[PDB]
Structure formats: structure tokens, C-alpha cells
Design a protein around this ligand. Structure first.
Ligand code: CA
Ligand code: CA
Length: 76
């Protein structure tokens, strides 16, 4: 639906809103999902669960590398 460069630009716009300008906090992931990919939230997982899954290193932030796990969902 979007090229990888276009997806990075959406990530970047939401990641710069608070805290780490290059990573997403849970609130930033919520804003991105609600605005751009709303079907991702009416799924089996809650936002807390999705955040916990994406955040592999457990640092409370989702990097662009971590965010890649969502692209199959988004693309398909
Ligand atoms: Ca951020
Ligand atoms: Ca992380």
C-alpha cells in the first residue's frame, strides 16, 4: 500500500512527537495506529499487548527495526 520509504516517513512523523525523537512510545504508537492503520487495533490484541510484542528489548520504545514486524499486517 506504501513503499518502505513512505512507511518510514509515517513512523518518523509520529516518533518525533515526544521523548526519543527516533522511537515510538506506547502513546505515539496509539496515535499512529488510530490515525493511519485503525484496523490494527480492533484485532485480537489490545494496544498494551501489541506494544509489548513489538518492544523486543523491553526498553519501553519501539524502534523502526522493531516496527517492521507490523508491515506484513499493513501490506496484506
Ligand atoms: Ca518518540
Ligand atoms: Ca525497544
Amino acid at each position: 500500500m506504501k513503499s518502505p520509504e513512505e512507511l518510514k516517513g509515517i513512523f518518523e512523523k509520529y516518533a518525533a512527537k515526544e521523548g526519543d525523537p527516533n522511537q515510538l512510545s506506547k502513546e505515539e504508537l496509539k496515535l499512529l495506529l488510530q490515525t493511519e492503520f485503525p484496523s490494527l487495533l480492533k484485532g485480537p490484541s489490545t494496544l498494551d499487548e501489541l506494544f509489548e510484542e513489538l518492544d523486543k528489548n523491553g526498553d519501553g520504545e519501539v524502534s523502526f527495526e522493531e516496527f517492521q514486524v507490523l508491515v506484513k499486517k499493513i501490506s496484506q
